[PDB]
Design a protein that fits this description.
The complex is a heterodimer of chains A (about 140) and B (about 20).
Chain A (H helix, E strand, L loop, with lengths): L1 E11 L2 E10 L8 E7 H13 L18 H12 L6 H35 L7 H8 L4
Antiparallel strand pairs in A: 1-2, 2-3
Chain B lengths: L1 E5 L8 E4 L3
Antiparallel strand pairs in B: 1-2
The chains are: A alpha+beta (about 140), B mainly beta (about 20).
Protein name (chain A): Sorting nexin-5
Organism (chain A): Homo sapiens
Subcellular location (chain A): Endosome; Early endosome; Early endosome membrane; Cell membrane
Chain lengths: ~140, ~20
């Protein structure tokens, strides 16, 4: 019994951080419930790692999550900071709301992609047990 | 320019929060 979700993520300029949260009945895990923080870059590492694992040949590895694109929204919010004095106050609020909804739309799609990939892994009978996958799930030494 | 995402508690709608950077 492995259940995985991403409750929250942060988009911050340089990177995107995903909180990957796990509930398990598996004994092999030290704890039943935990969370660790993973970058997109990490999921790709896992996927890369799985794909090249020899035992797992003749298994189909779930597709990796696509890289998050916050660029459009990011540029606008960077400008918006730019316009705080100058802009009519109302415009700024509407502009703030719209930019946020835009960031939000991206998050939803991207969170799903990353979440689905992990959930797809947990579902798999063989893959669910992979060591590299386990560390990704639980190694929370910051 | 850092944006924080919270998944909605079911069936709670999802959110984004500005952060300070």
């Amino acid at each position: 019994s492995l259940q995985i979700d991403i409750p929250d993520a942060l988009s911050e300029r340089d990177k995107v951080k995903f909180t990957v949260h796990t509930k398990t009945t598996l004994p092999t895990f030290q704890s039943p419930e935990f969370s660790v923080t993973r970058q997109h870059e990490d999921f790709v590492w896992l996927h890369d790692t799985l794909i090249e694992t020899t035992d797992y040949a003749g298994l189909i590895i779930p597709p990796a999550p696509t890289k998050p694109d916050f660029d459009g929204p990011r540029e606008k919010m960077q400008k918006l900071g730019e316009g705080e004095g100058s802009m009519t106050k109302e415009e700024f609020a509407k502009m703030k709301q719209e930019l946020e909804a835009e960031y939000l739309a991206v998050f939803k799609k991207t969170v799903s992609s990353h979440e689905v990939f992990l959930q797809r892994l947990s579902s798999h009978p063989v893959l669910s047990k992979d060591r590299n996958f386990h560390v990704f799930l639980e190694y929370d030494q910051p | 320019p850092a944006v924080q995402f919270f998944k909605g508690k079911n069936g709670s709608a999802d959110q984004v929060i500005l952060v300070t950077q």
